[PDB]
Amino acid sequence: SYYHHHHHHDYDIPTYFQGASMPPRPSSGELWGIHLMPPRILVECLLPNGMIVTLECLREATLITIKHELFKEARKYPLHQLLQDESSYIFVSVTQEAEREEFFDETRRLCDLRLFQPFLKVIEPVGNREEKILNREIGFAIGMPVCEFDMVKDPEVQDFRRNILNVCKEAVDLRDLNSPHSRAMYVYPPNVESSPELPKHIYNKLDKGQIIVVIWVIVSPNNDKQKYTLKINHDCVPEQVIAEAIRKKTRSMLLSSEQLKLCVLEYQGKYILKVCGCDEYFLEKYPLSQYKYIRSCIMLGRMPNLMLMAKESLYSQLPMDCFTMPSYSGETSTKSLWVINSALRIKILCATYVNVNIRDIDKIYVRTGIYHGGEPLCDNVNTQRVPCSNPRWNEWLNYDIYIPDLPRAARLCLSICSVEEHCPLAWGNINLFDYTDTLVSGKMALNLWPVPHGLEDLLNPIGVTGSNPNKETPCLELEFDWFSSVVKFPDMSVIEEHANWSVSREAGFSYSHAGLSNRLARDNELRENDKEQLKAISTRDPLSEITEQEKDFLWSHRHYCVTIPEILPKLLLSVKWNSRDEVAQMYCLVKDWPPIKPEQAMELLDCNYPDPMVRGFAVRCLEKYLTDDKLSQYLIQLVQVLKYEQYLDNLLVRFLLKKALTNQRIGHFFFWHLKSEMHNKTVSQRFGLLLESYCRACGMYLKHLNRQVEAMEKLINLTDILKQEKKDETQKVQMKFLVEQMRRPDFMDALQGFLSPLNPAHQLGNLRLEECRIMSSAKRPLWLNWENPDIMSELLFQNNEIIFKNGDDLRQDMLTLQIIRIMENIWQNQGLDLRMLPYGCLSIGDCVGLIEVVRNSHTIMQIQCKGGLKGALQFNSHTLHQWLKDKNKGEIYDAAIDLFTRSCAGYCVATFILGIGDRHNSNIMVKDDGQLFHIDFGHFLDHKKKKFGKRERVPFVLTQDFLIVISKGAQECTKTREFERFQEMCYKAYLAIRQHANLFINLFSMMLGSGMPELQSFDDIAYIRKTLALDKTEQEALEYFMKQMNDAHHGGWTTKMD
């Protein structure tokens, strides 16, 4: 009656679809195919005399210990007198990366060697430079051996490795320029806002520009400290602050005034300012306000705590970086591209590995096309030959574009398709010119890539240039027309001359033309209706596509466009890249175009601007305008944008690499963002090669990065065992296993002396195992807690705790928190105080990461479970508000509500615009002090509209709970002024972002590289157009926002002067 007695006969009750909750695994641990080696283990010790003594020794034994015992237990075997003293020997074995690694560091533990099979050959030290065979350190940091590169055939690779050192050498120069200062300046760059100005809402906190600061000192033995509370000008510098501390410290009844002045001067510059509780340092002329620690204190109602640290104790710590060149320290007479008189043609041959059902699929072909982002000719196919069963062509596809009209950045994109039954099988793209400027000619083998999740379209030009390094995949080879000579792309002198010729030739073209459009006839003197359709176009966002009229219109008035530098991105998308006439002329405008702002210039490194000249310009912008503060904000995007760079060596890489080697805070996140994506074999080579350069030249931080790396691998194994072998055990049982393991010496070693990768300022000391635990989630995330071993920990935080989560893919969270952070700074630097809490997140691997724990904060759900009465009948709307009053009693109350209402406002607007996952009581959080913030954001640009979805959703819907709180205690509170005030924040917040909507488009645009399913192509990013409403006028948008906020809430939003 329930089911019409319909039997489902297939349904097997045992097995299971991962429903009956943890995603991608696994990577192996301490020995081959076993996560965690047995505590006592048998190891075959191969000696120089050919004997195999099999030792038994513990999992955690050092090689000093294994050697020392092996040369005691080898005596008892035969041929003892054909062995030297043990000190004449070193261990060696085959690792899981399959390479013969020599074991120089004898303090290393047997479990920590990644050994594959449990054995150890004995040898005498070959290749006498021991020093140089600390490329171990580099390949450990990288997660592949350096020798794997030394055996790469490709000349580009080997050219990259040699030529990139140019940069490294220059960078190491800058570091030891005015040492030891410049070294400290590298290691401890000043953590500083890019604007010395102060928003009015901060200034107002200071009583006419004055902060109370507290300077701390230590005397004897190295124990007791002393405060020296100053009150100084916000805008005074560290050198002034150090003086005023010293004055106060050394005033006396025995020193006159004049005598004080002298004892200060001899002391003044012997010291520098530290921040208490972490390794941040105020090391150059900046307003104290402009340092971020200071500006945070001012907003948080706190009194700075600095320390007077002696330059010689700080320079004591900074060791030498002492850079060493590694062992690794075009063609003659050619024919120009422009000489060649033929159309392009390409011979397609023989796909071999094609896995298709001959039942289901009818017939299959190879689509092809030439590309520049978007394409310079008609797209064409071959005929549907030897369909399915052993696919074989020997055609010549003929492309209607002459060979001299191929732009420098041109690329062939191809794909194998099936049959309006059209359906792509495999894909792959080649650069038509190589990295040495050479037009490609001859036969090429190209192993193809699988179509991605979202990719319904059939060819894939945005996808990466190059062949799949995985051999066992559809390898379709092909032939490129060869013109008796290695063809090359012309010099710049040549391309200038063609342009100067092509412009003189334009002046003599006469009168009318049919579709004259693309040239003026208007003269140097241009109409005023023309000049105000141009600046009108200039304003429009990246995604508002241009019509062919507007293109030709722009392209005609191209020379006036030098008036409006900011128009360049549009201008370039109007050029016909299939007309070398046009393109040559463009190269000369772009040559000496006025530099633009970095936020404008980052568009020009997205996938739609492949030209080298263009991208070079954009880098020249960044070189001039983009600051170390603003760089390290956008670094994620600048690393993602590398993937669209045709060749290994380029300007973008050389820039980033240099900044990384020049400022250790960038370097740090530069490492992790590259390292993060080493599993993804599109980028493994490129990023590996880059990480090698960085690691080779960054000096002592490498050793620090190795410790972080060594710590994460331990944790990755730990969570892997918990998620596989120790599932279906009680938390109780799991947590024993956790403690038991962390106790062992190798873990104790590996997890104690290091720097948080979420922020390397924080040192992580001994871990407090009392407070470490496996959280309740199914992904088995680890709650980890460390002592803050800083001298004055107590002044900042005694304990430092962060979450390590093996399951989820952190990089969507990572990106949304970046976008929030940016909205905060946009708002706040317009005097508009909306307090977002973009908590820390870092992807370090394939679905592995780190999340900053915010202490004293609670999921609304907890609030309500805590304040819920027993006889569990229904929860109260007020419970939230009750809990919050309970925290904030007195004048304190009114300020807590302000915060809530300010943060609730930002997170409303932010969340609506970004389209993030629907909000509810277990992903909204409130702090004791009354700030609200979201977590576990989910898919951002509305990825569950790929199912059924113009929904234009509202994810943060303000239940009664919040509204009560927003308006003190009122009943039916939609009508209080408290809430009017609120709505006004929401309206001025919505608009403030809308005026910066370009950047947000561009930040999302630059991320298309990353294999994030939520960002497959531009229409994804086009959600953010509707929700910011850029087709509308701002007053229409305000109403659109009001309207959307009204309909989700059911009543509130229809009273303001827009």
Binding site: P24, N49, G50, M51, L79, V94, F119
Partner: protein, 212 residues
Amino acid sequence: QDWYREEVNEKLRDGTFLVRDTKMHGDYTLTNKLIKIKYSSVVELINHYRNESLAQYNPKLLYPVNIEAVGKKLHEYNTQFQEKSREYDRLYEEYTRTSQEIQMKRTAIEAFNETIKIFEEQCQTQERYSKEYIEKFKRGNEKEIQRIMHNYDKLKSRISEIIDSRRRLEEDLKKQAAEYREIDKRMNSIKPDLIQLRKTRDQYLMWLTNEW
């Protein structure tokens, strides 16, 4: 009223054209390439360029593409589509992790091989130095050599195991490689129907113009 951005581009997804509607900007638009639009009419100008090409204006438009009884078919086509999408989402997982697992084997096979060579070299290494001490001295004798025999006997029957172990891996590579192909095989079958199941679901919701 009765062919006439974001949802326009989704209807250009996969000659084909249509006409679109700031008013202080232009009026209508012909969408893929965009053409801004006497216009004597909107329907006048387009009929002329359906038969003919767009070359002569600027250096064809060939493809102008039950109120209660279609409603539940929106739930039905959606519930296979969303089943079918899951099947596609599962297999692309299996495909890739099987690709991963495969290459971990390939790398292990290399590691095995290098392991073996060090051992081959070891049994080679003992012969040079042991058969020096068999011919020097002689009259040690069996208290020496039958222990140097014992060591060696282990040295090779270990190598036996290591090559056994490698083979046993190599066979699994094949079975894994087989399964890898089979997954891809079915991926490519499910894909084209997934598009048709999706394309009709768009058409069914577009004719009507949500428990479903």
